[PDB]
Scaffold this active site. Structure first.
Site, PDB file in Angstrom:
ATOM      1  N   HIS A 131     -39.006   9.730 -15.598  1.00  0.00           N
ATOM      2  CA  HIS A 131     -38.663  10.240 -16.923  1.00  0.00           C
ATOM      3  C   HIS A 131     -39.608  11.373 -17.277  1.00  0.00           C
ATOM      4  CE1 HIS A 131     -37.030   5.986 -17.996  1.00  0.00           C
ATOM      5  NE2 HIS A 131     -36.000   6.785 -17.784  1.00  0.00           N
ATOM      6  N   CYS A 176     -36.660  15.874 -15.984  1.00  0.00           N
ATOM      7  CA  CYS A 176     -36.178  16.794 -17.014  1.00  0.00           C
ATOM      8  C   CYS A 176     -37.279  17.201 -17.984  1.00  0.00           C
ATOM      9  CB  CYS A 176     -35.005  16.166 -17.776  1.00  0.00           C
ATOM     10  SG  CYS A 176     -33.527  15.936 -16.748  1.00  0.00           S
TER      11      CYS A 176
END
Ligand code: DFH
Length: 268
Positions: A131, A176
């Site tokens: 993440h 991301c």
């Protein structure tokens, strides 16, 4: 006629590097109008890697392919690029050795390990798949719910700040919102410079990340370098973008601690 933006296509259907491509210069480089030297690594020294893949198994946002991204990079580096297994720390959250779990403490310790005693012309590699988020860009250890994230400023302080002149750190982020995760002041896209200081490390820090399953950046990087190992910085970006087009909603960007002559050969 634009050989920067419109490179020719070769027999492998990929973008060609410059006809005559140089290795990065050995001499100390300078930036005009200031006293901030830097030096490209020749990558002839020690090669070490820190590879981190986190699936957050069992949690509410378990991911599917990050551990696999880590294994892909491990395989690529050890079998292609002279990274010995004794010189790689791989942290993933599906295996049975606690000291290799990507908890916050283990990640911080591994980051310190990666750059410790790094000498000019060494070649260090960092890969992260898990993440990512922006608050600052941050990354999330497997125990982030209790320990919190690791923020960009801290990663810069641990891994970039101590580096001697001429030490290479190549970083690859599959996460991301990781575009500024090492606080690097130069950013390059396939179309040219998109960020630079308006006026510094003397090391040689470069990073690849994507901006809008499996890791798109490691997928593209590994395929391009496997099929056509000869690339400039720019042709590597262009070919990664070519590989990602249609299938992935990401475009690759290159950030750096120093200005890059993008026509130089990309080495590791
Ligand atoms: C990877 C592992 O499942 C784990 C441990 C802690 C957090 C997330 C995942 C593990 C490893 C060694 C011993 C126990 C558990």
């Amino acid at each position: 006629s634009n050989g920067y933006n419109n490179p020719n296509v070769n027999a492998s259907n990929m973008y060609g590097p410059p006809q005559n491509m140089s290795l990065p210069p050995p001499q100390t480089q300078t930036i005009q109008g200031t006293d901030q030297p830097y030096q490209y690594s020749q990558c002839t020294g020690r090669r070490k890697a820190l590879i981190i893949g986190i699936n957050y198994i069992g949690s509410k946002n378990q991911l599917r392919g990050c551990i696999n991204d880590a294994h892909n990079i491990f395989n690529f580096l050890t079998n292609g690029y002279g990274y010995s297994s004794d010189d790689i720390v791989i942290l993933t959250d599906d295996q049975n050795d606690l000291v290799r779990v990507p908890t916050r403490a283990n990640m911080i310790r591994a980051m310190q390990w990666l750059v410790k005693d790094a000498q000019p012309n060494d070649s260090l590699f960092l890969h992260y798949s898990g993440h990512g988020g922006q608050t600052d860009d941050v990354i999330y250890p497997v125990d982030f719910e209790t320990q919190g994230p690791i923020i960009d400023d801290e990663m810069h302080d641990i891994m970039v700040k101590p580096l001697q002149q001429g030490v290479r750190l190549t970083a690859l982020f599959d996460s991301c919102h990781s575009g500024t995760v090492l606080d690097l002041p130069y950013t390059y896209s396939t179309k040219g410079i998109i960020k630079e200081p308006n006026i510094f490390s003397a090391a040689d820090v470069v990073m690849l990340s994507g901006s809008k399953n499996t890791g798109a950046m490691s997928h593209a990087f590994i395929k391009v370098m496997t099929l056509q190992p000869q690339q400039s910085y720019l042709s590597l970006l262009q070919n990664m973008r070519k590989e990602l087009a249609g299938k992935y909603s990401q475009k690759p960007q290159l950030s750096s601690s120093h200005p890059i002559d993008v026509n130089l050969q990309f080495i590791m």
